Amino acid sequence: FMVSLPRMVYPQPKVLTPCRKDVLVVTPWLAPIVWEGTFNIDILNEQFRLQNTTIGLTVFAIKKYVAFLKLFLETAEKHFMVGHRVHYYVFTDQPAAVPRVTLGTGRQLSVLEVGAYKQDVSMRRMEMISCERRFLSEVDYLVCVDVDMEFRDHVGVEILTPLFGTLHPSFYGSSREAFTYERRPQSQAYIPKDEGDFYYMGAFFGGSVQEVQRLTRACHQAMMVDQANGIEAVWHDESHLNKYLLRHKPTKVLSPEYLWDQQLLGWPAVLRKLRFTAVPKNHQAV
Ligand SMILES: O=c1ccn([C@@H]2O[C@H](COP(=O)(O)OP(=O)(O)O)[C@@H](O)[C@H]2O)c(=O)[nH]1
Ligand SMILES: [Mn+2]
Description:
By secondary structure, the protein is an alpha/beta fold. The protein has one domain: Spore Coat Polysaccharide Biosynthesis Protein SpsA, Chain A (Alpha-Beta Complex). The protein has eight helices and ten strands. It is 26% helix and 17% strand. The chain starts with 32 loop residues before the first strand and ends in an 8-residue tail after the last strand. The structure holds uridine-5'-diphosphate and manganese (II) ion. Its main location: Golgi.
Protein backbone atom coordinates (compact mmCIF):
# COMPACT_ATOMS: atom_id res chain seq x y z
CA PHE A 1 0.00 0.00 0.00
CA MET A 2 1.21 3.50 -0.89
CA VAL A 3 0.14 6.62 1.02
CA SER A 4 -0.60 10.02 -0.56
CA LEU A 5 2.21 12.30 -1.58
CA PRO A 6 2.31 15.57 0.36
CA ARG A 7 1.43 18.91 -1.24
CA MET A 8 4.32 19.90 -3.53
CA VAL A 9 5.00 23.03 -5.50
CA TYR A 10 6.90 22.59 -8.75
CA PRO A 11 6.78 23.74 -12.40
CA GLN A 12 3.81 22.35 -14.32
CA PRO A 13 4.71 19.72 -16.93
CA LYS A 14 3.93 21.10 -20.39
CA VAL A 15 2.11 18.69 -22.70
CA LEU A 16 3.09 20.60 -25.88
CA THR A 17 6.71 21.01 -24.76
CA PRO A 18 8.98 17.94 -24.62
CA CYS A 19 11.69 17.94 -21.92
CA ARG A 20 14.30 16.76 -24.47
CA LYS A 21 13.94 16.87 -28.29
CA ASP A 22 17.49 15.70 -29.06
CA VAL A 23 17.08 12.16 -27.73
CA LEU A 24 14.63 9.25 -27.46
CA VAL A 25 13.16 9.35 -23.93
CA VAL A 26 10.88 6.29 -24.21
CA THR A 27 11.43 2.84 -25.75
CA PRO A 28 8.93 1.23 -28.19
CA TRP A 29 7.76 -0.98 -25.28
CA LEU A 30 7.03 2.19 -23.26
CA ALA A 31 9.97 2.04 -20.81
CA PRO A 32 11.44 5.46 -19.90
CA ILE A 33 14.98 6.17 -21.10
CA VAL A 34 16.47 8.13 -18.22
CA TRP A 35 18.18 11.42 -19.22
CA GLU A 36 18.78 14.61 -17.30
CA GLY A 37 15.70 16.83 -17.70
CA THR A 38 13.16 13.95 -17.96
CA PHE A 39 12.55 13.60 -14.20
CA ASN A 40 11.68 15.71 -11.18
CA ILE A 41 13.87 14.15 -8.50
CA ASP A 42 11.80 15.70 -5.68
CA ILE A 43 8.69 13.79 -6.77
CA LEU A 44 10.65 10.52 -7.20
CA ASN A 45 12.42 11.00 -3.86
CA GLU A 46 9.04 11.37 -2.14
CA GLN A 47 7.61 8.29 -3.82
CA PHE A 48 10.53 5.99 -2.85
CA ARG A 49 11.09 7.41 0.65
CA LEU A 50 7.39 6.84 1.43
CA GLN A 51 7.99 3.16 0.64
CA ASN A 52 11.13 3.13 2.92
CA THR A 53 13.11 1.87 -0.05
CA THR A 54 16.40 0.01 0.53
CA ILE A 55 18.86 -0.22 -2.36
CA GLY A 56 21.49 -2.96 -2.48
CA LEU A 57 24.65 -2.21 -4.49
CA THR A 58 26.84 -5.17 -5.53
CA VAL A 59 30.49 -4.73 -6.50
CA PHE A 60 33.29 -7.24 -7.10
CA ALA A 61 36.82 -6.36 -6.12
CA ILE A 62 39.02 -9.33 -6.95
CA LYS A 63 42.83 -9.44 -6.94
CA LYS A 64 44.27 -6.05 -7.99
CA TYR A 65 40.81 -4.43 -8.26
CA VAL A 66 40.70 -3.87 -4.49
CA ALA A 67 42.66 -0.68 -5.38
CA PHE A 68 39.48 0.80 -6.91
CA LEU A 69 37.33 0.43 -3.80
CA LYS A 70 38.30 3.59 -1.92
CA LEU A 71 37.37 6.01 -4.72
CA PHE A 72 34.33 3.90 -5.68
CA LEU A 73 32.85 3.90 -2.16
CA GLU A 74 33.74 7.50 -1.17
CA THR A 75 32.12 8.89 -4.34
CA ALA A 76 29.10 6.55 -3.92
CA GLU A 77 28.71 8.18 -0.51
CA LYS A 78 28.51 11.58 -2.17
CA HIS A 79 26.27 10.69 -5.12
CA PHE A 80 24.47 7.34 -4.94
CA MET A 81 20.95 7.23 -3.48
CA VAL A 82 21.70 9.91 -0.88
CA GLY A 83 18.80 10.16 1.61
CA HIS A 84 17.79 6.54 0.97
CA ARG A 85 18.77 3.31 2.78
CA VAL A 86 21.77 1.71 1.07
CA HIS A 87 23.47 -1.64 1.63
CA TYR A 88 26.77 -2.19 -0.16
CA TYR A 89 27.79 -5.82 -0.83
CA VAL A 90 31.50 -5.96 -1.57
CA PHE A 91 32.56 -9.33 -2.97
CA THR A 92 36.32 -9.80 -2.61
CA ASP A 93 39.11 -12.36 -2.24
CA GLN A 94 40.87 -9.96 0.18
CA PRO A 95 38.56 -8.84 3.01
CA ALA A 96 41.55 -7.15 4.77
CA ALA A 97 42.20 -4.92 1.72
CA VAL A 98 38.73 -3.38 1.88
CA PRO A 99 39.29 0.31 2.77
CA ARG A 100 37.65 1.78 5.87
CA VAL A 101 35.25 4.26 4.29
CA THR A 102 33.05 6.53 6.38
CA LEU A 103 29.35 5.97 5.66
CA GLY A 104 26.42 8.39 6.08
CA THR A 105 23.47 7.41 8.29
CA GLY A 106 21.20 4.55 7.02
CA ARG A 107 23.98 3.08 4.91
CA GLN A 108 25.85 -0.12 5.58
CA LEU A 109 28.51 -2.25 4.03
CA SER A 110 28.94 -6.03 4.04
CA VAL A 111 32.14 -7.75 2.99
CA LEU A 112 31.54 -11.11 1.25
CA GLU A 113 34.57 -13.29 0.76
CA VAL A 114 34.78 -15.23 -2.50
CA GLY A 115 37.46 -17.15 -4.43
CA ALA A 116 39.60 -15.50 -7.13
CA TYR A 117 39.50 -16.86 -10.69
CA LYS A 118 42.72 -16.81 -12.74
CA GLN A 119 37.11 -13.19 -18.19
CA ASP A 120 36.17 -15.77 -15.53
CA VAL A 121 36.26 -13.12 -12.77
CA SER A 122 33.88 -10.85 -14.75
CA MET A 123 31.72 -13.83 -15.88
CA ARG A 124 31.26 -15.52 -12.44
CA ARG A 125 29.56 -12.41 -11.04
CA MET A 126 26.18 -13.63 -12.38
CA GLU A 127 26.60 -16.92 -10.50
CA MET A 128 27.93 -15.20 -7.37
CA ILE A 129 25.03 -12.69 -7.37
CA SER A 130 22.35 -15.39 -7.85
CA CYS A 131 22.93 -14.62 -1.67
CA GLU A 132 19.41 -15.35 -3.04
CA ARG A 133 17.37 -15.53 0.19
CA ARG A 134 19.56 -12.88 1.92
CA PHE A 135 19.01 -10.06 -0.64
CA LEU A 136 15.25 -10.75 -0.49
CA SER A 137 15.32 -10.14 3.27
CA GLU A 138 17.60 -7.07 3.26
CA VAL A 139 16.93 -4.90 0.20
CA ASP A 140 14.16 -3.90 -2.23
CA TYR A 141 16.28 -3.30 -5.33
CA LEU A 142 19.67 -4.51 -6.40
CA VAL A 143 22.14 -2.52 -8.55
CA CYS A 144 25.08 -4.45 -10.00
CA VAL A 145 28.11 -2.40 -11.09
CA ASP A 146 31.80 -2.52 -12.04
CA VAL A 147 34.30 -1.35 -9.38
CA ASP A 148 36.74 0.52 -11.74
CA MET A 149 34.44 3.51 -11.61
CA GLU A 150 33.67 6.67 -9.67
CA PHE A 151 30.49 8.63 -9.14
CA ARG A 152 30.73 12.24 -10.34
CA ASP A 153 27.08 13.31 -10.15
CA HIS A 154 23.63 12.24 -8.92
CA VAL A 155 22.64 8.57 -9.34
CA GLY A 156 19.35 8.16 -7.56
CA VAL A 157 15.92 6.61 -7.36
CA GLU A 158 15.13 7.70 -10.93
CA ILE A 159 16.89 4.43 -11.94
CA LEU A 160 14.68 2.14 -9.83
CA THR A 161 12.22 -0.15 -11.58
CA PRO A 162 11.62 -3.91 -11.83
CA LEU A 163 14.40 -4.34 -14.48
CA PHE A 164 16.93 -1.91 -16.00
CA GLY A 165 19.85 -1.90 -18.40
CA THR A 166 22.24 0.95 -19.31
CA LEU A 167 23.15 2.15 -22.83
CA HIS A 168 26.85 1.38 -23.54
CA PRO A 169 28.61 4.72 -24.10
CA SER A 170 30.44 3.55 -27.30
CA PHE A 171 27.34 2.30 -29.16
CA TYR A 172 24.30 4.47 -28.34
CA GLY A 173 24.56 6.03 -31.83
CA SER A 174 25.25 2.74 -33.65
CA SER A 175 23.00 0.75 -35.93
CA ARG A 176 22.22 -2.76 -34.65
CA GLU A 177 24.35 -4.59 -37.24
CA ALA A 178 27.37 -2.77 -35.75
CA PHE A 179 26.53 -3.89 -32.16
CA THR A 180 29.14 -6.33 -30.79
CA TYR A 181 26.55 -8.98 -29.85
CA GLU A 182 27.52 -12.67 -29.90
CA ARG A 183 26.99 -13.61 -33.59
CA ARG A 184 27.71 -17.37 -33.50
CA PRO A 185 24.43 -19.44 -33.49
CA GLN A 186 26.21 -22.06 -31.37
CA SER A 187 26.09 -19.71 -28.35
CA GLN A 188 23.10 -19.18 -26.05
CA ALA A 189 23.95 -15.46 -26.34
CA TYR A 190 23.46 -15.44 -30.12
CA ILE A 191 21.62 -12.48 -31.63
CA PRO A 192 21.16 -12.21 -35.47
CA LYS A 193 22.00 -9.03 -37.39
CA ASP A 194 18.29 -8.15 -37.86
CA GLU A 195 17.52 -8.22 -34.11
CA GLY A 196 18.46 -5.95 -31.18
CA ASP A 197 17.10 -2.82 -29.57
CA PHE A 198 20.19 -1.43 -27.86
CA TYR A 199 23.66 -2.42 -26.77
CA TYR A 200 23.60 -2.54 -22.98
CA MET A 201 26.70 -2.10 -20.79
CA GLY A 202 27.63 -5.10 -18.59
CA ALA A 203 28.95 -2.68 -15.96
CA PHE A 204 25.53 -1.32 -14.74
CA PHE A 205 22.24 -3.21 -14.54
CA GLY A 206 19.67 -3.82 -11.79
CA GLY A 207 16.06 -4.02 -10.76
CA SER A 208 13.96 -5.56 -8.02
CA VAL A 209 15.63 -8.41 -6.12
CA GLN A 210 13.28 -10.89 -7.86
CA GLU A 211 14.08 -9.63 -11.38
CA VAL A 212 17.85 -9.38 -10.77
CA GLN A 213 17.89 -12.96 -9.43
CA ARG A 214 15.97 -14.11 -12.53
CA LEU A 215 18.39 -12.32 -14.81
CA THR A 216 21.52 -13.58 -13.03
CA ARG A 217 20.15 -17.14 -12.82
CA ALA A 218 19.30 -17.12 -16.55
CA CYS A 219 22.71 -15.69 -17.52
CA HIS A 220 24.53 -18.19 -15.26
CA GLN A 221 22.52 -21.08 -16.82
CA ALA A 222 23.24 -19.81 -20.39
CA MET A 223 26.97 -19.45 -19.64
CA MET A 224 27.01 -23.01 -18.24
CA VAL A 225 25.36 -24.37 -21.41
CA ASP A 226 27.97 -22.49 -23.47
CA GLN A 227 30.87 -23.90 -21.38
CA ALA A 228 29.52 -27.45 -21.79
CA ASN A 229 29.34 -26.67 -25.54
CA GLY A 230 32.99 -25.49 -25.71
CA ILE A 231 32.05 -21.89 -26.52
CA GLU A 232 32.69 -18.58 -24.70
CA ALA A 233 30.66 -15.51 -25.77
CA VAL A 234 32.60 -12.63 -27.41
CA TRP A 235 31.93 -10.17 -24.56
CA HIS A 236 31.33 -12.79 -21.86
CA ASP A 237 28.68 -11.74 -19.26
CA GLU A 238 27.83 -8.65 -21.32
CA SER A 239 26.88 -10.80 -24.34
CA HIS A 240 24.50 -12.84 -22.15
CA LEU A 241 23.11 -9.68 -20.50
CA ASN A 242 22.31 -8.36 -23.99
CA LYS A 243 20.56 -11.56 -25.02
CA TYR A 244 18.49 -11.55 -21.80
CA LEU A 245 17.45 -7.92 -22.17
CA LEU A 246 16.50 -8.47 -25.83
CA ARG A 247 14.09 -11.25 -24.82
CA HIS A 248 12.98 -9.68 -21.49
CA LYS A 249 12.56 -5.95 -22.13
CA PRO A 250 13.79 -3.69 -19.31
CA THR A 251 11.19 -1.46 -17.65
CA LYS A 252 13.69 1.47 -17.70
CA VAL A 253 16.81 2.06 -19.75
CA LEU A 254 19.51 4.31 -18.36
CA SER A 255 21.15 6.80 -20.74
CA PRO A 256 24.97 6.83 -21.13
CA GLU A 257 25.07 9.59 -18.46
CA TYR A 258 25.02 6.52 -16.18
CA LEU A 259 28.05 4.73 -17.66
CA TRP A 260 30.54 7.05 -19.34
CA ASP A 261 34.24 7.17 -20.16
CA GLN A 262 35.36 10.80 -20.46
CA GLN A 263 38.98 9.95 -21.43
CA LEU A 264 37.73 7.82 -24.32
CA LEU A 265 34.62 9.72 -25.41
CA GLY A 266 34.84 13.29 -24.07
CA TRP A 267 31.71 15.24 -23.12
CA PRO A 268 29.31 15.42 -26.11
CA ALA A 269 26.39 17.79 -26.37
CA VAL A 270 23.77 15.08 -25.66
CA LEU A 271 25.17 14.57 -22.12
CA ARG A 272 24.06 17.18 -19.60
CA LYS A 273 25.72 15.28 -16.74
CA LEU A 274 28.44 12.63 -16.46
CA ARG A 275 27.19 10.62 -13.46
CA PHE A 276 29.19 7.37 -13.16
CA THR A 277 32.48 7.16 -15.08
CA ALA A 278 35.34 4.84 -15.91
CA VAL A 279 38.55 5.21 -13.91
CA PRO A 280 41.54 5.01 -16.26
CA LYS A 281 43.43 1.75 -15.93
CA ASN A 282 46.14 -0.32 -17.58
CA HIS A 283 43.97 -3.28 -18.60
CA GLN A 284 46.52 -6.11 -18.95
CA ALA A 285 48.70 -4.82 -16.08
CA VAL A 286 45.76 -4.59 -13.62
O1 LIG B 1 41.01 -8.91 -11.93
C1 LIG B 1 39.84 -8.54 -11.93
C2 LIG B 1 39.12 -8.39 -13.12
C3 LIG B 1 37.78 -7.98 -13.09
N1 LIG B 1 37.15 -7.70 -11.84
C4 LIG B 1 35.74 -7.25 -11.73
O2 LIG B 1 35.04 -7.42 -12.99
C5 LIG B 1 34.65 -6.08 -13.42
C6 LIG B 1 34.71 -5.99 -14.93
O3 LIG B 1 36.06 -6.09 -15.39
P1 LIG B 1 36.82 -4.78 -16.03
O4 LIG B 1 36.32 -3.57 -15.32
O5 LIG B 1 38.28 -5.02 -16.07
O6 LIG B 1 36.22 -4.84 -17.52
P2 LIG B 1 36.07 -3.53 -18.48
O7 LIG B 1 35.20 -2.45 -17.92
O8 LIG B 1 37.55 -3.02 -18.73
O9 LIG B 1 35.49 -4.15 -19.82
C7 LIG B 1 35.63 -5.13 -12.71
O10 LIG B 1 35.02 -3.84 -12.61
C8 LIG B 1 35.70 -5.76 -11.34
O11 LIG B 1 34.48 -5.50 -10.63
C9 LIG B 1 37.88 -7.83 -10.64
O12 LIG B 1 37.34 -7.58 -9.55
N2 LIG B 1 39.22 -8.25 -10.69
MN1 LIG C 1 34.99 -1.92 -15.87
